[PDB]
Paper text:
Factor-inhibiting hypoxia-inducible factor (FIH) is an asparaginyl hydroxylase acting on hypoxia-inducible factor (HIF), a transcription factor that mediates the hypoxic response in humans. The FIH-catalysed hydroxylation of a conserved asparaginyl (Asn) residue within the C-terminal transcriptional activation domain (CAD) of HIF-α reduces the interaction of HIF with the transcriptional coactivator p300/cAMP-response-element-binding protein (p300/CBP), thereby inhibiting HIF-mediated transcription. In addition to HIF-α, FIH also catalyses the hydroxylation of conserved Asn residues within the ubiquitous ankyrin repeat domain (ARD)-containing protein family. Here, we report the unexpected findings that two histidinyl residues in the tankyrase-2 ARD, located at analogous positions to the asparaginyl hydroxylation sites, are also substrates for FIH-catalysed β-hydroxylation.
To investigate how a His residue is hydroxylated by FIH, we crystallized FIH in complex with Fe(II), 2OG and the TNKS2 538–558 fragment under anaerobic conditions. The resultant overall FIH structure (2.28 Å resolution) was similar to reported FIH structures (rmsd values of 0.30–0.33 Å for Cα backbone atoms) and reveals that the backbone of TNKS2 538–558 is bound to FIH in a manner that is similar overall to analogous ARD fragments that undergo Asn hydroxylation and a fragment of the HIF-1α CAD substrate (rmsd for Cα backbone atoms of TNKS2 versus mNotch-1 and CAD ∼ 0.2 Å). At the N-terminus of the bound TNKS2 538–558 fragment, residues 541–546 form a short α-helix, possibly reflecting that in the ankyrin repeat (AR) of the parent tankyrase ARD protein. At the active site, the Fe(II) and 2OG are bound as first reported for the structure of FIH in complex with Fe(II) and a fragment of the HIF-1αCAD. In the FIH·TNKS2 538–558 structure, the β-methylene of His 553 is positioned such that the pro-S hydrogen of its methylene group projects towards the Fe(II) centre, suggesting that it is hydroxylated to give the 3S-hydroxy product, as observed for Asn hydroxylation by FIH. Histidine binding at the FIH active site apparently induces a stacking interaction between the substrate imidazole and the phenolic rings of Tyr 102FIH and His 199FIH, which is one of the iron-complexing residues. The imidazole side chain of His 553 in the TNKS2 538–558 fragment points towards the γ-methylene of the side chain of Gln 239FIH. Previous structures have shown that Gln 239FIH binds via hydrogen-bonding interactions to the side chain of Asn residues that undergo hydroxylation, for example, Asn 803 of HIF-1α. However, in the TNKS2 538–558 structure, the side-chain amide of Gln 239FIH is moved away from the side chain of the hydroxylated residue (i.e. with His 553 compared with a hydroxylated Asn residue) such that it is positioned to make a hydrogen bond with the backbone amide of Tyr 102FIH.
Author numbering:
A (entry chain S), D (entry chain S): 540 to 553
B (entry chain A), C (entry chain A): 11 to 349
């Protein structure tokens, strides 16, 4: 879960 | 060695472009493959999230006829985001983040306007001889003209939708229409979305760096307005502050009308409209990435570690109650302990 | 200036100890207050988690009669952990962590034995003249003799239990009995538990550093066997690796039979049995700290940031699947970005 | 919760 927590990512673009 | 021997425009119209139109940099580059969408090697590259230039997708075939006059007459009168700058470099700025870093001031300003207003200013500079630069970056939406909608519908959704499915990617989040002046440059940065870069008018030199070159490109702190962008000035590299930039190696290519460049998520990309090559028009296709796999494999991949670092910076910033405290805590954590 | 003018033992038995019994260090120190448990200033210090030496608690009054002969005859025959070393420094080692760091080898070995066996070895060295050092560090439990149990029950539980309640601390987790040879030293480190250090026999010089001096004491990486301990050799400080140790300032004092030193959680403490002062006996009282407050106040306190840093190191170690990858990721995160 | 997560601590001693 911690890895899964740290692996999540946003979807930021320009 | 670079983007290779300039391609020859069919009909004996000579070289599509020439070397003197490319800017000069301190680093070496290997060519990104140019293949057919039917070529299994191309499907192999995309599946493995490595860049590839597709020559015959017909992705935006209907748009290949586009130009300022046609778009002005058919794009409608909604507002178009237009960035201005006194330099060829258009550094992106996250305004929601401009609150944090207070003593901060953009090198390029945003401005809304109607398409015809944009063409006017584009024209105003041209006929006088000014040094100002403009870059139109606007999301395609509900307010475009009927004909534009016809073109849009003509896009090769069959091919791309199948690409979306095969990769397990998320949803298409947007299509950014980009119209820039020759010589314009979007500094190296990476995006958190899979991208199908569809070139329509003019030529663009695209320099990509793998995610594993994070330590050579030095991105600004996550809470900084220029988050995800490299702090290194490609035109005048500060090797004292950014030592490992001397070790950076890129992948480049020049895209023209009809080409689609797959920019894998997290890959750095520097994009410039060839010098003295006229305006350029591009339309990208941003897709949310696939979800995190049910089973992690070790060691992690570069883009995953980049995801982890970003998170650590976010957690600390929120935990410390102030983004400016992230750096000091981080330094205190490693100094004399991990370095 | 140090632990102040040596206290005079009642009955005109002269100075309890003298300066030549203290080791010499490169840093300055201010005295920890010596007060009465009835003194509201003492209750003020504890409530604010600052060290204080209590002179009249009677916490371990029944143990003040303890000595090797009495304990040997009454402690029972359970096993007693005894650490050995060829130096006066007894660096702690977490064995569950010795798996990670492979090319690792302790400067002190642990060994089980009966109390009488310990007294034997203590005696063996004495009558010959050896250089070996022993430190008995064993938790008090179910297998101690009847008389020891009588003494234990005689402890001032009324006073300490009330201290436990007033601070909202967790449960008493243990009582470590510590019997060491003169000159022995427990290097600077911090504990994650509130501590009531009860001196019983001999004298100990206690040097404490506030949590906010984390950057001057350079603890080993969290996954290292010596986690929570300073990497700086107090006897020969490496100012090239640990620059800020030149800025460290301590709080010291010398405890004797009857004194109780409150070592607040997260406070660094260096503890040494005075040179040529005979053996020493201490019994500590480790309590889990109070739970995290329902409302966080900003900016955070030093000990909280220390808690945050520790967590970051733990998360990264588990996330990266390998503790040895923590340092490199951390450096990649700050180099040219936060430093 | 994130702060609460990062504020939690063990109870390691000697
Ligand atoms: O074409 C450009 O100048 C920028 C395009 C870009 O950064 C993207 O599509 O992610
Ligand atoms: O007395 C000693 O040598 C060590 C005591 C200690 O580190 C503690 O009680 O936390
Ligand atoms: Fe981009
Ligand atoms: Fe301790």
């Amino acid at each position: 879960s911690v890895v899964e927590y740290l692996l999540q990512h946003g979807a930021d673009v320009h | 060695s670079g983007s290779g021997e300039p391609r020859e425009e069919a009909g004996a119209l000579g070289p599509a472009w020439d070397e003197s139109q490319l800017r000069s940099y301190s680093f070496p580059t290997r060519p990104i493959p140019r293949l057919s969408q039917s070529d299994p090697r191309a499907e192999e590259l995309i599946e493995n999230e490595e860049p590839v230039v597709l020559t015959d997708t017909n992705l935006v075939y209907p748009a290949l006829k586009w130009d300022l006059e046609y778009l002005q007459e058919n794009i409608g009168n909604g507002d178009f985001s237009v960035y201005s700058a006194s330099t060829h470099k258009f550094l992106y700025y996250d305004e929601k983040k401009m609150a944090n870093f207070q003593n901060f001031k953009p090198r390029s300003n945003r401005e809304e306007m109607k398409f015809h207003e944009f063409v006017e200013k584009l024209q105003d500079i041209q006929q006088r001889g000014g040094e100002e630069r403009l870059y139109l970056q606007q999301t395609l939406n509900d307010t475009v003209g009927r004909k534009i909608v016809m073109d849009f519908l003509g896009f090769n959704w069959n091919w791309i939708n199948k690409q979306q499915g095969k990769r397990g990617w998320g949803q298409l989040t947007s299509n950014l229409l980009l119209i820039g002046m020759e010589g314009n440059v979007t500094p190296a940065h990476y995006d958190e979305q899979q991208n199908f870069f569809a070139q329509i008018k003019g030529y663009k030199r695209c320099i990509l760096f793998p995610p594993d070159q994070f330590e050579c490109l030095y991105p600004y702190p996550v809470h900084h307005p220029c988050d995800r962008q490299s702090q290194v000035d490609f035109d005048n590299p500060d090797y004292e502050r950014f030592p490992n930039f001397q070790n950076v190696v890129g992948y480049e290519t020049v895209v023209g009308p009809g080409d689609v460049l797959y920019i894998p998520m997290y890959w750095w990309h520097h994009i410039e409209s060839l010098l003295n090559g006229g305006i350029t028009i591009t339309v990208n296709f941003w897709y949310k990435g696939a979800p995190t796999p049910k089973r992690i494999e070790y060691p992690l991949k570069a883009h995953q570690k980049v995801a982890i670092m970003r998170n650590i910076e976010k957690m600390l910033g929120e935990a410390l109650g102030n983004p400016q405290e992230v750096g000091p805590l981080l330094n205190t954590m490693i100094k004399g302990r991990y370095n």
